[PDB]
């Protein structure tokens, strides 16, 4: 009740909406870790994966929206 479409959007995000990114960040924290939680640093690092266009700053903002 959420999954849809395929998965293949490495080179830059699909112009996703700010709202989509939110759930995206939270989704990443869906199965975080205690000794390796998806903190703003992590999620932010994830972006380095050459996927979405985030940033410690942006993540920080989201962190508050969810964290």
- Among 62, 55, 56, residue whose Cα is nearest residue 24: 62
3-state DSSP call for residue 54? coil
- Among 54, 6, 5, residue whose Cα is nearest residue 28: 54
Count CB-CB contacts under 10 A for residue 44. Answer: 20
Q: What's the Cα-to-Cα distance from 48 to each of 1, 2, 37, 51, 52, rounded to whole Å? A: 29, 25, 17, 7, 8
Experimental method: NMR
**CATH code for the domain defined by 17-67:** 1.10.10.60
């Amino acid at each position: 009740t959420y999954s849809l479409r395929t998965f293949f959007v490495r080179e830059s995000a699909e112009g996703l909406t700010q709202g989509e990114l939110m759930k995206l960040i939270k989704e990443i924290v869906e199965n975080e870790d205690k000794r390796k939680p998806y903190s703003d640093q992590e999620i932010a690092n994830i972006l380095k994966e050459k996927g979405f266009k985030v940033a410690r700053r942006t993540v920080a903002k989201y962190r508050e929206m969810l964290g």
